[PDB]
């Protein structure tokens, strides 16, 4: 019986993938030492970072590293992984939450750094921690159509400033319990970068395929997590609960359009938000935890770069083999939930 | 191949309510002009910007984009429940996270199927957003899309005026900051749709982009125009473009010198280039759709009119697209 493609992407591949780990380690132990007087004043006796959130360390850049710098570093690495020159790139999309300026785009700055040709289309996409997937989808539609041969999706996150200013606010003798709780999740963020080269499958016959997938939203929850360059406020409780509710809705759609059943997927590359988020997600959908790599523990939450960083790390570790069915998914501020598939 | 089944179902713009005249601004800058020995009225006489609009205090980009979106929905005569994609393309943004799109969408009450995100690309983003939406519409992923753009500049004026009139500011800094005093507030939204749903609606054909990211305001001019020429050459090949066959050019709204340079370089009839920066200043990526909406509202657009949407944006980037009314 002839069936439709369910609008999944055809002939779109992943030609190259790379990640950058930021150089300076900041441990939760050091952070707690700094916060201890405030903990004591608030009567907080558990390690809310290392034991509850499950984050033991995260990485930071130097103060003077911009989103675009980190993104550029990842891009050059991904180009090498794809064994192609920048002159072949017809589209470059930057998907980071971190941003150099209001304008021009961070993508234009990265493109300038790399030396893209005058045919290269560039722009930023912003959608909290799901934007890398959005950028992949945007690139995929052009590649499928045959408009371009290769695309770069890039993402550099700088959390230095938010750490600096949050730690200052959270150690004020005047800080309230409410503001402390509001800003706590900022201390689970991490720096890092990722880049991906995507291509028409014709050019890279043995490369992984990207099929795309599905999205559902609950934009009535757009206030749950709000962040600027120096401050992030989060309702962690509702983020968790409403996130899981939305994911259940998305999974139903995934089953319909992707044919997903959890036992048949080989890897789940998921949003890296916290141990409790991960535990709840895995438990909600009856996922085998062995199929869910996490990096939150030593890198924290790297926003929209998290997913591709985890994928790149799976690649470098030799965890992925030809034929493996890889679920890429995330819940991001919005609220939004996207689920997509890669066949290695 | 150009897009064959992508149409414009609805279009609206919002003019911001408060006028700040350049004469009013100038009275505040006079002492500083004198100090630097300038003498020239850069805003009024050079840039040709005599006024711009400002929102009420505490209007956010999302608020302005929401007002426009509601008006565009009415223009399209559809309910919010029909929207499957909402893209926000504004330079102004409420936060880094979440997207300004999600906030506008929460204000409108979009459905749980509605995909949203922001696109940022200086003054070109609306055209980028249209193109992204067109691709989804064409593939049958959605039936209707909103592309929205709300720009706020209130804070810019307060901050910049104070800063530029402070002691020790150089002629260099002062002139750079004058540029900020050409920015205006405003909003626009467009409903795009699959054509079989809206026969007789204008059709979006798509377009071309060229970039000069090596260039990353007097230079913005010449280099931008050079980039535009390159882009127009490409446009000729994908769109069948010839200057004399286009009925309107809807362009980035930056200044008189930018506009005159563009018109002269391409040998365009200035009557085919509506401008609004005289009264509204530079509204960033909202400028193009605001001008298109004003042309529509004013009865300037006729069935079969061939319309060039184009912008020269920071990057440098240049994008051109065609709408057939």
Swiss-Prot record, chain A:
Keywords: Acyltransferase, Cytoplasm, Manganese, Metal-binding, Transferase. Pfam families: ACP_syn_III, ACP_syn_III_C. GO terms for cellular component: cytoplasm. Mn(2+) binds at residues 24, 62. It catalyses: a 1,2-saturated acyl-CoA + an acyl-CoA + H2O = an (R)-2-alkyl-3-oxoalkanoate + 2 CoA + H(+). It is an enzyme of class 2 (transferase). PANTHER family: 3-OXOACYL-[ACYL-CARRIER-PROTEIN] SYNTHASE 3 (PTHR34069), ACYL-COA:ACYL-COA ALKYLTRANSFERASE (PTHR34069:SF3). This is Acyl-CoA:acyl-CoA alkyltransferase. It comes from Xanthomonas campestris pv. campestris (strain ATCC 33913 / DSM 3586 / NCPPB 528 / LMG 568 / P 25). The lineage of its organism: Bacteria, Pseudomonadati, Pseudomonadota, Gammaproteobacteria, Lysobacterales.
């Amino acid at each position: 019986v002839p069936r439709g493609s369910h609008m999944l992407f055809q002939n779109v591949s992943i030609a190259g993938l790379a990640h950058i780990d930021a150089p300076h380690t900041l441990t939760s132990k050091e952070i707690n030492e700094r916060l201890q007087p405030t903990y004591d004043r608030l009567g907080i006796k558990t390690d809310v970072l290392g034991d509850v959130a499950g984050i033991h360390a995260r990485r930071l850049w130097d103060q003077d590293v911009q989103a675009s710098d980190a993104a550029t570093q990842a891009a050059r690495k991904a180009l090498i992984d794809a064994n192609i020159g920048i002159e072949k790139i017809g589209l470059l999309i930057n998907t980071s939450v971190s941003r150099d300026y209001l304008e021009p785009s961070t993508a234009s700055i990265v493109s300038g750094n790399l030396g893209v040709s005058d045919h290269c289309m560039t722009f930023d996409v912003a959608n909290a921690c799901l934007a890398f997937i959005n950028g992949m989808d945007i690139a995929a539609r052009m590649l499928e159509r045959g408009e371009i041969d290769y695309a770069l999706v890039v993402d550099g996150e700088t959390a230095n400033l938010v750490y600096e200013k949050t730690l200052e606010r959270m150690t004020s003798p005047d800080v309230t319990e409410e503001e402390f709780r509001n800003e706590l999740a900022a201390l689970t963020l991490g720096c890092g970068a990722a880049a991906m080269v995507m291509a028409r499958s014709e050019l890279v016959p043995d490369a992984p395929r990207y099929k795309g997938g599905v999205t559902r939203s609950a934009t009535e929850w757009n206030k749950l997590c709000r962040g600027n360059l120096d401050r992030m406020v989060t309702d962690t409780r509702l983020l968790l609960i409403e996130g899981i509710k939305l994911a259940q809705k998305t999974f139903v759609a995934a089953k319909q359009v992707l044919g997903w059943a959890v036992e048949e997927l080989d890897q789940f590359v998921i949003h890296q938000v916290s141990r409790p988020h991960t535990a709840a997600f895995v438990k909600s959908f009856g996922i085998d935890p062995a199929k869910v790599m996490t990096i939150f523990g030593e890198h924290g939450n790297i926003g929209p770069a998290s997913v591709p960083i985890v994928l790149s790390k799976l690649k470098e570790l030799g965890r992925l083999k030809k034929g493996d069915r890889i679920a890429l998914l995330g819940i991001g501020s919005g609220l939004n939930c996207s689920m997509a598939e890669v066949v290695w």
